[PDB]
Amino acid sequence: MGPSLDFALSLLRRNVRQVQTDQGHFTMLGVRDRLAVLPRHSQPGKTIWIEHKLVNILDAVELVDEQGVNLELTLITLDTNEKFRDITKFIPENISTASDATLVINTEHMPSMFVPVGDVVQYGFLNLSGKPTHRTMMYNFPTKAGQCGGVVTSVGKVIGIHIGGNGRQGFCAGLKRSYFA
Ligand SMILES: */C(=C/C(=O)OCC)[C@H](C[C@@H]1CCNC1=O)NC(=O)[C@H](Cc1ccccc1)NC(=O)C(=O)NCC1CCC1
Numbered sequence: 001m002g003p004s005l006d007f008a009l010s011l012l013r014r015n016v017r018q019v020q021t022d023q024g025h026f027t028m029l030g031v032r033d034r035l036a037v038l039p040r041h042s043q044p045g046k047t048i049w050i051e052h053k054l055v056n057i058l059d060a061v062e063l064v065d066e067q068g069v070n071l072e073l074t075l076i077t078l079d080t081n082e083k084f085r086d087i088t089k090f091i092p093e094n095i096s097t098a099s100d101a102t103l104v105i106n107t108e109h110m111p112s113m114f115v116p117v118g119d120v121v122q123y124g125f126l127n128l129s130g131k132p133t134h135r136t137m138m139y140n141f142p143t144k145a146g147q148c149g150g151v152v153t154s155v156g157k158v159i160g161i162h163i164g165g166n167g168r169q170g171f172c173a174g175l176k177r178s179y180f181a
Pocket residue numbers: 023024041072126127128129131142143144145146147148163164165166167170171
């Protein structure tokens with residue numbers, strides 16, 4: 001088997017988990033140790049359903065930039081035995097664009113799902129349901145409900161988390177390594 005598909009399947013196996021909050025189904029990225037990331041609008045509570053069991057959340061941190069403005073990402077620290085494989089070295093130091101990327105989704109409704117969103121470009125400001133958001137990127141693919149939390153990847157790099165779309169385009173929150181230091 002080739003190397004792009006090997007890395008994507010390895011993500012699914014070790015780092016990209018099926019979750020449910022009171023807002024419904026999401027894809028969750030485990031970054032290292034007991035630290036994961038979800039979209040802010042998933043509103044993780046005191047507990048979260050992960051794959052086949054209810055896991056306690058020890059801490060949640062919603063990320064905003066210096067402008068006080070929403071970045072649409074919540075860092076969760078989980079109460080588990082599991083250490084996630086550390087994938088911080090695949091996350092660029094600065095939010096990066098990409099050609100021919102793939103969005104990897106993993107939900108109970110959309111399990112191990114691969115979506116070819118194409119090129120991923122700087123976009124910046126986005127308005128999601130009256131919530132202003134910075135540091136977004138855009139792909140010209142008609143993403144859909146149930147795909148938030150999805151992992152934007154390409155060439156062994158992990159560059160975003162899907163948060164939105166308008167029926168013709170999709171949008172992720174950009175990743176940078178400093179968030180997971
Ligand atoms: C993922 C979450 C979901 O399924 O929620 C359903 C209860 C979706 C995926 C979107 C929907 C349509 N196509 C997609 O890719 N995301 C959302 O629904 C966004 C939720 C949200 C984000 C931030 C703050 C609050 C809520 N919202 C949107 O996609 C949206 O409201 N508008 C799209 C439009 C383009 C820029 C604004």
